[PDB]
Write a protein that holds these residues in place. Sequence first.
Motif, short mmCIF file in Angstrom:
data_model
loop_
_atom_site.label_atom_id
_atom_site.label_comp_id
_atom_site.label_asym_id
_atom_site.label_seq_id
_atom_site.Cartn_x
_atom_site.Cartn_y
_atom_site.Cartn_z
N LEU A 84 33.12 37.79 60.19
CA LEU A 84 33.08 37.10 58.91
C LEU A 84 31.79 36.35 58.63
CD1 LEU A 84 36.67 35.63 58.79
CD2 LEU A 84 35.88 37.84 57.95
N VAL A 87 28.82 38.09 56.70
CA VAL A 87 29.13 38.37 55.30
C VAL A 87 29.11 37.06 54.51
CG1 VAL A 87 30.67 39.55 53.73
CG2 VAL A 87 30.53 40.29 56.10
N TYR A 88 29.76 36.03 55.05
CA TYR A 88 29.77 34.73 54.41
C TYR A 88 28.35 34.22 54.18
CZ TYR A 88 30.96 29.80 53.68
OH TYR A 88 31.09 28.52 53.17
N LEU A 91 26.52 35.60 51.16
CA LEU A 91 27.07 35.33 49.83
C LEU A 91 26.45 34.11 49.18
CD1 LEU A 91 30.87 35.82 50.55
CD2 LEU A 91 29.36 37.43 49.37
N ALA A 99 35.74 33.60 49.50
CA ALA A 99 35.99 33.93 50.90
C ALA A 99 36.83 32.87 51.60
CB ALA A 99 34.66 34.14 51.64
N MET A 102 40.51 33.16 50.54
CA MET A 102 41.26 34.19 51.25
C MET A 102 41.63 33.75 52.65
SD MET A 102 39.60 37.79 50.07
CE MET A 102 40.91 38.73 50.85
N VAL A 103 40.69 33.15 53.37
CA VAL A 103 40.97 32.71 54.74
C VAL A 103 42.00 31.58 54.76
CG1 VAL A 103 40.01 31.62 56.79
CG2 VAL A 103 38.81 33.53 55.71
N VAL A 111 43.27 38.71 57.40
CA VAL A 111 42.09 39.33 56.80
C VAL A 111 41.53 40.46 57.67
CG1 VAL A 111 39.61 38.86 56.43
CG2 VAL A 111 41.32 37.51 55.23
N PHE A 114 40.50 44.03 56.35
CA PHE A 114 39.56 44.07 55.23
C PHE A 114 38.15 44.54 55.61
CE2 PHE A 114 42.87 41.39 53.35
CZ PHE A 114 42.88 41.81 52.03
N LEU A 118 34.74 43.93 53.40
CA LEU A 118 33.68 43.12 53.98
C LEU A 118 32.34 43.84 53.88
CD1 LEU A 118 35.49 41.67 57.09
CD2 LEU A 118 34.39 40.34 55.30
N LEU A 121 31.10 43.90 50.27
CA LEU A 121 30.61 42.58 49.90
C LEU A 121 29.24 42.31 50.51
CD1 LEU A 121 33.93 40.50 50.22
CD2 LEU A 121 32.70 41.05 48.10
N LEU A 133 39.46 45.58 47.40
CA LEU A 133 40.25 44.40 47.73
C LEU A 133 41.65 44.48 47.15
CD1 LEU A 133 37.50 41.69 47.20
CD2 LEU A 133 38.84 41.95 49.29
N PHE A 153 34.81 37.23 43.24
CA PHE A 153 33.91 38.10 44.02
C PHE A 153 33.15 39.08 43.12
CE2 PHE A 153 36.59 37.54 48.04
CZ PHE A 153 35.57 36.95 48.79
C1 LIG Z 1 36.97 40.02 52.64
C2 LIG Z 1 37.70 38.96 53.48
C3 LIG Z 1 37.27 37.53 53.11
C4 LIG Z 1 38.07 36.50 53.93
C5 LIG Z 1 35.77 37.32 53.36
C6 LIG Z 1 34.83 37.85 52.48
C7 LIG Z 1 33.47 37.66 52.70
C8 LIG Z 1 33.05 36.91 53.80
C9 LIG Z 1 33.98 36.37 54.67
C10 LIG Z 1 35.34 36.57 54.45
#
Ligand SMILES: CC[C@@H](C)c1ccccc1
Length: 164
Positions: A84, A87-88, A91, A99, A102-103, A111, A114, A118, A121, A133, A153
């Motif tokens: 995660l 990706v986080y 963003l 994000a 969702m968590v 998650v 996904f 991910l 994204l 999604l 998103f």
């Molecule tokens: C796609 C799952 C979601 C919890 C997420 C998305 C982008 C970065 C971290 C987590």
Amino acid sequence: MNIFEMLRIDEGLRLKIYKDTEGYYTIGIGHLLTKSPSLNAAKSELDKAIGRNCNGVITKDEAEKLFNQDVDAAVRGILRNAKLKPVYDSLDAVRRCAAINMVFQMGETGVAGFTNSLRMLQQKRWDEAAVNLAKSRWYNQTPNRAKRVITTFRTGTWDAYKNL
Ligand SMILES: CC[C@@H](C)c1ccccc1
């Protein structure tokens, strides 16, 4: 808008133990107490979380304290997770809120499936991610909330929340 306002809209505020959308005992702003069917088990978790004998009821200040803790935990969960975090980090601030949302709702566990979303994204393929999604138990079971999060998103704006 910020992550607290967003989750307050999505989770609501209730000061007495209630069952969430999945039937689990919960309190405050979406604070899960237990997945056990036992209300007594939930009451015990509540007393442990708040640090006094609550008899199933808390104050707004107490609800907001659990909420602060829970948002903090969601963010920390993301930063500690090797799947995660990258990706986080990729963003923008608005999509980071989606994000965290969702968590907060599903945990790191919920998650897990996904992976493909991910990747999309991370690649900033927003429309593709949005389509992916929605192909989820998440989307089918809580479609109005999922639509708001997905719109966030897709667009990187608060358009889905501004009106509420
Ligand atoms: C796609 C799952 C979601 C919890 C997420 C998305 C982008 C970065 C971290 C987590």
